[PDB]
Structure formats: structure tokens, C-alpha cells
From a paper:
Podophages that infect gram-negative bacteria, such as Pectobacterium pathogen ΦM1, encode tail assemblies too short to extend across the complex gram-negative cell wall. Here, we report a near-complete atomic model of the bacteriophage ΦM1.
Bacteriophage ΦM1 encloses the viral DNA within a highly decorated T = 7 icosahedral capsid composed of HK97-like major capsid proteins (MCPs) and two similar, but distinct, accessory proteins. Two decoration proteins, gp44 and gp43, are individually expressed off the viral genome and bind across MCPs at the 2-fold and quasi-2-fold axes of symmetry via formation of homodimeric α-helical bundles, where each dimerization domain consists of a helix–turn–helix motif. We refer to these bundle structures as α-claw motifs, as corresponding density bears resemblance to claw clips. The gp44 consists only of the α-claw motif, which we refer to as the α-claw protein. We refer to gp43 as the α-paw protein. While the α-claw is a small protein (∼6 kDa) and is composed primarily of two α-helices, the α-paw is nearly three times the size (∼17 kDa), due to the long C-terminal forearm domain. The α-claw and α-paw decoration proteins, although similar in the helix–turn–helix domain, may serve different functions during infection by virtue of their structures. Both decorations likely stabilize the capsid as they bind across MCPs, which is a common function for accessory proteins in large capsid viruses which can reach up to 60 atmospheric units of internal pressure once packaged. Given that the α-claw appears to form a stronger interface with MCPs and does not encode any additional fiber, we hypothesize that this protein is required to maintain capsid stability. In contrast, the α-paw likely contributes to stability to a lesser extent but may mediate additional functions via the fibrous α-paw forearm domain, such as host recognition and adhesion.
Author numbering:
A (entry chain H), B (entry chain I): 2 to 62
C (entry chain A): 3 to 55
D (entry chain B): 56 to 327
E (entry chain A): 110 to 327
F (entry chain G): 56 to 109
G (entry chain G): 274 to 327
Write the structure that this text describes.
Amino acid sequence: AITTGTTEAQALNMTMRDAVLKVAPGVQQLVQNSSQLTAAEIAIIQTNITALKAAFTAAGA
Amino acid sequence: AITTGTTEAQALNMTMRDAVLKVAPGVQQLVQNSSQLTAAEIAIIQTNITALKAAFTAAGA
Amino acid sequence: DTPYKADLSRVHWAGSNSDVDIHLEIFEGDVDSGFMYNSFFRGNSSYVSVQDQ
Amino acid sequence: SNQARIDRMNTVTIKGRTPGQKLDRESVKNDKLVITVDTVTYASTVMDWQDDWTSPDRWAEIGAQHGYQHARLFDTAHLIQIIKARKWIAPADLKPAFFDGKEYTAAYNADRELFAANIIDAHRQGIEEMVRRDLGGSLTEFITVVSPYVFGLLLDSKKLVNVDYSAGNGNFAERRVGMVNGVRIVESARFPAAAGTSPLGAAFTVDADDVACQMVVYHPKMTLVTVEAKPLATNKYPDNPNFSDILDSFTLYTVGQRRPDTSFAVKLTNLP
Amino acid sequence: SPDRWAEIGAQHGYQHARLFDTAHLIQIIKARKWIAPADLKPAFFDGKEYTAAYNADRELFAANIIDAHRQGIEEMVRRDLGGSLTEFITVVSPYVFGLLLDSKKLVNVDYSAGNGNFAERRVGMVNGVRIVESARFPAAAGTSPLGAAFTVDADDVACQMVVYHPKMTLVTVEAKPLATNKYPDNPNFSDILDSFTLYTVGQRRPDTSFAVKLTNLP
Amino acid sequence: SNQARIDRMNTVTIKGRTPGQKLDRESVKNDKLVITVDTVTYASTVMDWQDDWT
Amino acid sequence: HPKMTLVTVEAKPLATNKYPDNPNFSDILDSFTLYTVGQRRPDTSFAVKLTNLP
């Protein structure tokens, strides 16, 4: 469960924020246009998505 | 794996994109202030994250 | 209970139903940083200058 | 829009050098803050033409009564938001320039003098902590808000009213006291009385622990920020098809914390 | 991105101002260890240090601090310096400054009338020397940018009260005042800003000062 | 900044009615577009003073 | 369509800069810019593809 009391939880909460904010700008590009749909960039999106799940699990969400 | 170029893929990608922007603002408030850290509000973020995980699984990312 | 609830047009709300927030932030000249400080012990000592000698 | 933004920044560090050496350089970090508006508060009244034609006028009384509730809610929200800022933990990215929110406790005692002494000790601890952060030169701008219970307790202290120590400060018989630890004292009746919800939203709920804090110190410029999208307004109009008149008053705003490093709260424990 | 140079420039000066005062105090805290050379012994005296004992009750701790200060004042009086007590200065940290106010003989009116006020956080003198409050005392052991002469040990960190003579104890030697310089590096894609200064602090007459230490703090 | 935004919006439809009938209402929908700049393109040449003087 | 198909976002238009490098006894000349291109309305264009080329 999520906690917000101590510095140990603060670090995990901070990591989640910048883990999700890296994913945020890619999904919009995935749908708004056909400019940046090369197979080489979907790979970066996939790695960011994979890191997001690990951040969630570490934070205990 | 992520796929593009079809109506079903576009619908799944749109759903995945729309699921992320709900979680996006909650995490910022989770770390920026102490005014929105009550037990009643973290429950909404928990459901948002649970829906985001299902959206990721459905989209295949 | 308003009769128009099912036909509202929400400007900055996207998605299949108007739930996602895409508003724009408003910014002005505000920047927070550390507090200021000024020296106090500058006059309480004997002083000598050798700058160019 | 329904949002506002403010920026944050860190500080630098000093080093040393000798002839023949090159200077070193370091990076600086930054972050942001955002607030949002989510709820409208209102009050409405309706009347019929036939009743209005056969009764003395009373619209002025209701119009006068409408604004008192708005003022009371505003003050209550202000105090509630001030109290909640005693639990913030500063992120490591801004540690040198930003600090944490503090809280101090006072132990309940059967005697009133000892209770007042404990409260004054907690206040002294808070003031010392504030002074250690280079803010000691602006203690003339801070304010202390106390509920009537604490205000009455403060007069029972062995000092702050005794001429031998605090000449010209307060009077026991007249129920008067002006200053403590170099900061002004203000009495307010808007403190929450019991746990519950509020019409403003879910960010203003209070539990048992929150109600125990009846003393707070803050800076009236650098602590809170108010975001407003619609100032309070009124409008009285007739509903011609329905044979009646209506009166409305509404507003839209919110309150948020800006710098929790410039305030602290005192908590009373083991109350009966 | 928007421009942000003014804030950095201000912080650059704030940090220098903060370092000056702490470097000023670190040297006074070290004079307590001075031993006079043999050839000058009859006219020069060694430095002194006194200790206070921690106690749970605040008034007793304040009494201990006051007695420790009184011992140093009495030692000063014996070196024929008693005729200049109006020139000395006392520097006290916020903690010790707040401990003094609890004593019920410096603030009372039956004794020491006219000196201090409990409600306003005001104190005027102690044992005939005026008091000054500063927050620049070192907080932890470590090295300093100014060299090896400014290193602080876990024992110098425990001294939180100091007395010295402004015109006779320390001497400051300066070779370049503070200056700033901003310039572009054309061969690269960067802009830079700098600040620099050159100075030091020394000891002249260590036998005109003393320090008090707090022992067994929890 | 390093990015810009453009808005998107849908359209409406036409209807008709006879006397006594009410009017219906319709809901419009929105979206957005974002662009970003990341890379710089350049050219450069270098000369020596001795060759420049001659 | 030359008016509805593309959009150009610019952070610095084309500029030049000539300077000397005193310690290295040489001169340099540079030109640089920072921009990008994106799709505004893909609705108003199409492409023709050749197939089975040898």
C-alpha cells in the first residue's frame, strides 16, 4: 500500500513521478500522427513502459 | 507487442493513452504538498493505477 | 438532475467521454529559492592590505 | 484555465583553488508546483408572487444573512489548510534550500500553570527552530493564532503577565495578553470543533488528530496561495413562466500551501 | 527556456556572506589551545577553556553556563584587563541564548533591574559584557575550503559561547575583494559565470579570549 | 519553450421540426496536438592566420 | 495542399557567427539553426507507390 510518512517512502514516491512523466509524452505521439511510428521508437516506448511497472512495484502501489 | 495501422490497434492505443493522463496529475500532488495526503484520496489513485495496469495488459505493451 | 447533463459540450476535456484533463497551466513571475543573508562580523577585526605588493 | 504554476530552485557551493589549477563547476536543480479548482459553493432561496403581495418585505434580512456563512466558510478553510502543513517531507533534490514541516506536543496537566509552561516551552522550541533558518530578522511579521481555550490558558502562566518579568504585557483581571516569545497573539473562533467533512471538497476533511492542534504560527505572505476563478456574486431574477422569484449567490476558489518551511503547529495530548 | 541568471547571481553572494562569518568564528574557537612561547612567557599568557554540565532541569543548566562565564570573566580581570569590559563582546548560539532567559535572576527586577524582558525575548548583558546572537556556528565535523588550518574536530563543535576583543584578537589580511565575471566560450556552446576572492584570517593575541564548552549533551 | 500546441474539434448536424415540437441538443468533442524540437543542424569551417594574410 | 498539410516549429532561425580563437592562432565561421517539421492534417494528401520494380 502507498505510504507518505517518511523519507524512505518519499524516495519511492519521487521515483514514480519521473517514471510516469517519461511515459506521458510518448503515448500522445503514438496516436496524434504517423510521423514517429518507426519500429525503432516503439522500442524506446516499450523500455519506458517496462520501467514504469518496476517503479510501481517498488513503490508498492 | 504494440501495433499500429488498424482500427482495433488505434482504439486500444487511445484507451491506453487516456488511462495514463488520469494517473499523471495524482502523482504530482502525492509529492508536492501535504494538503492532499489523506487516506480517502489515495484510494482514487490506487484505482487509477489498477485501471492503468489493465489498460497496459490489454494493449499488449 | 439538469436536463442537459447528457448533452454538455466540455471544451478542454477529451476521450470517449469528457473525463480527461488537457487544460493549460498559467504562469507568472514567481520563483522560490533560498533565503537571503548578510554579513555582520565585517568590522570586528584589524585589517591590512597587501593586494599588489 | 483552472490551474496555476510556480517554480523552485536550489543554491550553490563554494570551493578553493591554488595557482595552476582549473575551476570546477556544478549543476543546479529545479522543480514546480501546481494548484487546481474543483468546486462551487452556493445558497439559494425562492418565493411566490402571491405570498410576496400579502406580507411585509423580508428580502433585506435574507440578503444580509447570506454573506455571513460565506465569510465563516472562508475563514474556516484558511485555518484548516494552515493546520494540515505539519507533515511535509522535503525531497532530496532541494534539501539545502528547503526544509520540512514541524510539529510539537504539550502534555496535559491537572494544574493550569504547568500546562501553560509546557505550551510556552513548545512555542519556544518552534521559535528557536525558525531562528536557526536565517528567518530571525523578520519575527515582526509572523502571527500566532490560538483558540479561546489556549488563550484562556496562557493567562494562567507564572509569567507573561507578572510585572517582575513582562511589565506592560497583559492583565489577569481584564483578560488581556499581547505577545509571547516576540510574536503577536490573535484569538479566533473558527477552529474546527469535531471530525467531519466540509462542502469545499475532500481536501478539507479533518480527523481526531487534526482537532488537537489549537495553536499555529505562520507568515502572512509566503505560506499560502489562493486561486480564484469566480469572485463572490449575487443575482436576483424572476421566473416568469412559474410565477415566482429566485435569489442566488455563488463563488469558485481554493487554497493551497506554498512554503511549508515557514510555519509549525502545536498539539495537545492526553486530553480528558 | 526563460532567463534565470539573476537568482544565481544573488545566491553567489549569499553563499560568500555566509562563509565569511563562520570562518570568522572558527578561528576564535581554536585560540583556546594556544600556548605561549617560552621566551615571551612572562608577558604572554596561555588560552583558557571552561566546561558546563548538562542537566535535565533547564534552570540548573543555565546556572552552570553562567558560572562558567563568570570564571572566565574573573580570569580576565586578573590580567589587568578589567578596565575595558565595555569593549568585549559575547557571541551565543540560539540554543544557549534561549537557555539564559530561563534563569530567574538576569530577567527579574529585584535583581538586575532594567536588563531584559521575558515576553519580548530581550536580554542586555551577562556579568558586565553585552550579548549578541549568531547562527553561524559549525554544525558538524569536516574540512573547509580555506585550508587545513580551518578543520574542526568533534570537540570544537561543542563550544557554543565565545568572548573576544574586536580590535586586539584577530587580524584580517586581504589581497583581492569580491568580483564577478561573465563571458561566452565561443569555441564551445556554453556561457559561464564566476566569482572569486582572496583573503585569510589570523590570530594576534589569543590571550584576550576564552571559550565555554557544553559536555554530555544527549 | 521547446514545444507548441494546436487544438482539434468536431462538427455538428442539422435537423428539422414542425409546430409544437421541442429542440434537441448535441455534444461536441475535443483533442489536441503537440510538437517538439530536439536536434540542431550546423556547418563550420576554419582557417589559419598565416594563410589568411597571404 | 500548401496551406493545410504541414506545420513548422522554430526555436532559432538561421544565423551565423564569426570569431577568432586567439590561443590557437586561427579563425572559425559557423552557421546553425534549430527547428522541426510535423503533420497538421494528413487528410489532404496522398502518395503513389510503384511496385514490382526490377
